[PDB]
Amino acid sequence: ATVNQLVRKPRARKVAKSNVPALEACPQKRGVCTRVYTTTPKKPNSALRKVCRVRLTNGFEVTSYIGGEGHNLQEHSVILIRGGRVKDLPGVRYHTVRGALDCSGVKDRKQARSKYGVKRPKA
Amino acid sequence: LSKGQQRRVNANHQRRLKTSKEKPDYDDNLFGEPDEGIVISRFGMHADVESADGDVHRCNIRRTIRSLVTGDRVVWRPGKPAAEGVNVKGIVEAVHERTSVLTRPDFYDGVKPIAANIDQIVIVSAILPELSLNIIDRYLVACETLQIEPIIVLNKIDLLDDEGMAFVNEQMDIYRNIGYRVLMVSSHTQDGLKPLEEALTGRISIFAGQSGVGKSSLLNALLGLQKEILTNDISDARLYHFPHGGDVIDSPGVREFGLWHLEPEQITQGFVEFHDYLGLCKYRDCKHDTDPGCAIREAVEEGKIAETRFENYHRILESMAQV
RNA sequence: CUAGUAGGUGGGGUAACGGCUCACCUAGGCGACGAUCCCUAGCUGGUCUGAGAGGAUGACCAGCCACACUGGAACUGAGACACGGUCCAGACUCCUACGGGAGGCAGCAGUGGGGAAUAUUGCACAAUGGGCGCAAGCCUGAUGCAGCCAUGCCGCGUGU
RNA sequence: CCGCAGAAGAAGCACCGGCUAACUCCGUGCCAGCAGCCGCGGUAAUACGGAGGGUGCAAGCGUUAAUCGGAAUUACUGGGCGUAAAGCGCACGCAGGCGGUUUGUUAAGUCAGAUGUGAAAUCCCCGGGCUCAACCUGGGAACUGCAUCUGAUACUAGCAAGCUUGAGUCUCGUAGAGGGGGGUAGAAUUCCAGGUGUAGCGGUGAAAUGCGUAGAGAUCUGGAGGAAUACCGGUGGCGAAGGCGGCCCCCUGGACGAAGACUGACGCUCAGGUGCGAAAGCGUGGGGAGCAAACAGGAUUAGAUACCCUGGUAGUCCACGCCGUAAACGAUGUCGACUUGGAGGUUGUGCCCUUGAGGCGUGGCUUCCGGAGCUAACGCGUUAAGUCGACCGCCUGGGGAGUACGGCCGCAAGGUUAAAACUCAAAUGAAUUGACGGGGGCCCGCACAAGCGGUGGAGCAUGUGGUUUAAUUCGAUGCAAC
Ligand SMILES: [Zn+2]
């Protein structure tokens, strides 16, 4: 528009709202659960989920989804987050690594075993 | 929603119950053994269910459940064993066939059963400020149609006086004349709490009244522990348990027993008394109004049939076509 | 909004211009051309991205600067207000014959601990580099390497 | 580097619904689960679990975390605010921004050369060297700046020195609800003193409080007052906006036209700054007709601290002051100049047998239709939302939240300014088609209507539903089952 104006205020683009704030470009963080909560899915898109508030070390609780199917999580239970989000569960924005720390792999998935970090079979 | 897909689906859910009951460990691991329960509280998306053990569990309700409501006793699970123990964690795997239950009328939104497994439905009511037999009249038909027992309870009697009661009790005598059950009392005052207590003895029933009839007083009067707030001014699906046995589905609505339209020939069956007023009339199709030689009319203006009952019965039929 | 503040006189001080300084004088100086006040930040060449212009940055290597346990100090000196000097107050620390003392890993290696995570308490003076030295040479965790890491990149291959 | 064994010791992981390259069999049955997205699964799922088959990728792979890229997704290049987010009500003016027409001028900007400067490594052009590559090395190019010097002098700049079409000015008119102040009347009505007069009046889909024989209502006369100023009057006017309507006077602002004469760029915009602000409310103090939040009765209703009725305070009008929001709207920033028009509106005038109402021009602005044009559309379209230029304001998805907190203001309300967290994944637009109406209109048919005979009661047959039965076979049921 004008120069005039431009010289006074610079243009301004957005500053992105960080979807997480497990931050300090968190790769991963240990957290510790709280308990393993449970909550409903979304209005049409419906599934139960094993999720859990997590007592992260940087200090921010938040409930994570517990991936896959199989399980091993208590109330008190050091755990490791990753981001994520169950696009059908509000409040999820994470994802606790399966196979990490306080869990190993679930039983016998075969496909994509890295997701749900599982060994290689006996071959 | 698919009546067909709904059907085939029904069978599946049904088998799931019996199959799960067959025995457990094959089911297992996330959740624990199935057990019976009834629905006390409705969390919209959750439900509080009291177990056989007698400990309530807030549970999820698998989509596979078309619906659920208060007064629904049936099978259930909580998550695991471990999981109930930190924080009420459970889920409702399936439900049972509501043996006895009732629904609300509505306008757009269709009829929805309010509660199931009911032995008696005590109509509340209150003298403050003023009653309207109409609300009770319409309710009487409901109790007959679901083949439930009705108890009318004129409450808050302590609020009446000389020229206040002499017109209350008598005016209600109609119920004592046609064989209905009633017990004047006043929650605030705890009067006639003996008769009711006995009546509720070994029975499965609940109390619902119109706008502000002392429902909170009576439910809180019989048995009230850590929770006596449901009075207070003029204002407002959980079926609470009784002190002497029996449960009462309280949701903030039920007490306002509206009136839904079931059939046009049933209205005549609503009241047993009609069993003698529908014998021989003037017109084979005499709707009992301004016909020449009617039977119900010749009885009403004759002193036997309570006029008030006529106006109310006639209004009910005119209320349905109000759609 | 600014007090030793702005200048101007005087002196004093620095290797040197100056309020640098003391003393003296004047009463300015400053501000939307955002002073000042606040939050956050090593700076920079770069680096990544983008057709570009720009955008996001600022590891590694090189220029700059600043810091060396918390602080506040000068001295010494070519040169320092001086990481592995000095003194003081300070917090720790630690030792002690309880009188007093000793200590400084934003080096190197390793330790704790912190964390999502980042490697040996290895080797060498051979080369290059530097200190000191008259060379000799000595010293030099700079450095050359060697150890570890599929961290990235590249290649090769695991068979035809 | 030479050598010897021997296929030996060495391939993985993901993905394959669509986007987005890749498909089947089972299991599962809105469960378990998925996942970037849209979304998948409630009995044949290419998406879940398993299996196979193909696609990809490679010692490496995926995922997660990170940055920009895509994104022209802040829009210099390179967006937008008539209706989808976005023009402040509205004005005025200092900083500022922008600048009619001549010359001179400087050489400031500009330009141009030139003089320098711009570590090295990157990078790039070109080459070479490590078996290739990465890498390395050499050379060039480049690193698009600053500075200085010597000019160049079109424009911009500064000043100088000029002009006239901008602006401004004088003059002469017009029209106009421009205002402010003070008068003043009528219409009507509240209330009144009475006239007449009478049961009822008043109120309502029905009713009631209320006034009603104390004479209401009604009628007539007078009077008091309160509030607001019909018909005109308008698709009208004037105003910066908000708005401003009886007639009269006083003080006052702006707009426009015409001969003209005059000045001489004195202008445009404008942050801040200034003043003004539809209705609420405030001061304080009056007032008080009508109306009317609150409040009180009556009614309605299942309830009805509603709509309706009797009403009625606050308020309303006056002053005064304070309060500062308006869908403050043409939902359309400012000032300027342009580019097709037709009918129109109200005011001005030249000229022209006005001989007439006037004709033909000529200015103002505003309506309605409207080309090109422009536009996502609708649409707009010489009064532009076209083409432009200059200035100024704003908008950066939805909710969050016009809120919080700070601020400032303020009697208080409250205004103003304006976030975060988060959460959502789309909201939003318009246009398109149908459906949709207790919308409206337009038709007929035994729809009504016009008649005929009916059916409906009464006794009997089919049937059928209830009820019953050991069985009372199975299906057909709002007209379209009987
Ligand atoms: Zn009859």
Swiss-Prot record, chain A:
An MF annotation (GO) of this entry: structural constituent of ribosome
Gene Ontology biological process terms from the UniProt entry: translation
Transmembrane intervals: none
Sites of N6-acetyllysine modification: K107
SUPFAM superfamilies: Nucleic acid-binding proteins
NCBIfam families per the UniProt record, alphabetical: rpsL_bact
Similarity remark: Belongs to the universal ribosomal protein uS12 family.
Record's protein name: Small ribosomal subunit protein uS12
Species assigned in the record: Escherichia coli O45:K1 (strain S88 / ExPEC)
High-level lineage: Bacteria, Pseudomonadati, Pseudomonadota, Gammaproteobacteria, Enterobacterales
Swiss-Prot record, chain B:
Keyword Transit peptide listed: no
GO CC annotation terms, alphabetical: cytosol
Consequence the record notes for mutating K215A: Reduction in GTPase activity, 38% of wild-type kcat for GTP. Strong reduction, 5.2% of wild-type kcat for GTP
EC identifiers of the protein: 3.6.1.-
Residue spans of biased composition, Polar residues class: 1-12
Region described as Necessary for association with the ribosome and for stimulation of GTPase activity by 30S ribosomes: spans on this chain: 1-108
Cofactor comment: Binds 1 zinc ion per subunit.
InterPro entries on file: G_CP_dom, NA-bd_OB-fold, P-loop_NTPase, Ribosome_biogen_GTPase_RsgA, RsgA_GTPase_dom
Residue numbers binding GTP: N155, K156, I157, D158, G209, Q210, S211, G212, V213, G214, K215, S216, S217
Cofactor(s) the protein requires to work: Zn(2+)
UniProt function note: One of at least 4 proteins (Era, RbfA, RimM and RsgA/YjeQ) that assist in the late maturation steps of the functional core of the 30S ribosomal subunit. Binds the 30S subunit contacting the head, platform, and rRNA helix 44, which may assist the last maturation stages. Removes RbfA from mature, but not immature 30S ribosomes in a GTP-dependent manner; 95% removal in the presence of GTP, 90% removal in GMP-PNP and 65% removal in the presence of GDP. Circulary permuted GTPase that catalyzes rapid hydrolysis of GTP with a slow catalytic turnover.
Notes on the domains: Has 3 domains; an N-terminal OB-like domain (about residues 1-100), a central, circularly permutated GTPase module (residues 104-270) and the C-terminal zinc-finger domain (residues 280 to 350). The C-terminal domain has 2 regions; the zinc-binding domain (residues 287-319) is required for binding to 30S ribosomes while the extreme C-terminus (residues 320-350) helps remove RbfA from the mature 30S subunit.
Name assigned to this protein: Small ribosomal subunit biogenesis GTPase RsgA
Annotated source species: Escherichia coli (strain K12)
